[PDB]
Amino acid sequence: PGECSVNVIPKKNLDKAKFFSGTWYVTHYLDMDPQATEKFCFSFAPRESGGTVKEALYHFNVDSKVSFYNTGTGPLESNGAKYTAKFNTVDKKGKEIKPADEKYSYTVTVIEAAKQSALIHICLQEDGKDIGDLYSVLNRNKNALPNKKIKKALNKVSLVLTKFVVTKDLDCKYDDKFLSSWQK
Ligand code: HEM
């Protein structure tokens, strides 16, 4: 039911310093649950050091106008483009307002990255079992379209970009300061 997609392949030789820097916006997303129709905006600031990823996450529920903040931490796989994180909930100033629930995790795979674009996949789990998954197209610019290389990657696993929700058309509110100040 909440089974995560197969054939999610980590990019070979992802440039760590480039990917794990700055702020990424989700320009297009595809939630593999067809009934997940609430509109969201998302941005994050992933960082890596000594084999451990530490990232700040920002969601904005467009339906409800409520934003939420998390931080995630986990080991980067030897392949250098996949990681499984545990997450807490923080407030806008970075202070923990709810501890990590040990029964939850998520696994990020960076499928492709090109110029200012990337394609990632996220598998959400509870007690090590799949509970849902989503593909996201990332860009450094919220208003930009993906590089063709990102399209090729989508096409390799029989996904088409037209199926994705386009976020630039939504009434997104972003907390950019939360992400830009991450680990400063
Ligand atoms: C635009 C793309 C995305 C959409 C539409 C989306 C959608 C959602 C939704 C609907 C929820 C549940 C919210 C609720 O319980 O009210 C959620 C939760 C969550 N998502 Fe996302 N997501 C996106 C991207 C991501 C990414 C890229 C990551 C990881 C890097 C991520 C990690 C999480 C985490 C950690 C939660 C925690 C839920 C909780 O605290 O209960 N999401 N997302």
Numbering used by the authors: 2 to 185
Provide excerpts from the study.
Nitrophorins (NPs) comprise a unique class of ferrihemeproteins originating from the blood-feeding insect Rhodnius prolixus. They participate in the storage, transport, and delivery of nitric oxide (NO) from the insect to the bite site, where NO acts as a vasodilator and as an anticoagulant to facilitate the feeding process. Coordinated to the proximal His60, the heme iron is stable in the ferric form, whose NO affinity is low enough to make the release mechanism physiologically relevant.
The X-ray structure of NP7(E27V) was solved in order to examine the impact of the Glu27 mutation on the structure of the heme cavity. Data collection and refinement statistics of two X-ray structures solved for NP7(E27V) at pH 6.8, the aquo form and the complex with heme-bound imidazole (IMH), are provided in Supporting Information Table S1. The AB and GH loops in NP7(E27V) closely fit the arrangement found in wt NP7 solved at both pH 5.8 and 7.818. However, this can be explained by the reduced conformational flexibility imposed by the head-to-tail arrangement of proteins in the crystal lattice, which involves numerous salt bridges between the clustering of Lys residues at the rear surface of the protein, and the negative charges located at the heme mouth. In contrast, NMR studies showed that NP7(E27V) mainly contains B-heme, although a significant fraction of A-heme was also found (ratio A:B of 1:3 at pH 5.5), thus revealing some degree of heme rotational disorder. Note that breakage of the Asp32-Ile132 HB was found even at the acidic conditions used in crystallization (pH 5.5), as was also found for the X-ray structure of wt NP79, suggesting that this structural feature likely reflects the disturbing effect caused by the head-to-tail electrostatic interactions in the crystal. The close resemblance between the X-ray structures of wt NP7 and NP7(E27V) may be misleading for interpreting the functional behavior of NP7 in solution, as key structural details, such as the heme orientation, the spatial layout of the AB loop, and the absence of a HB between Asp32 and Ile132 may be affected by the packing.
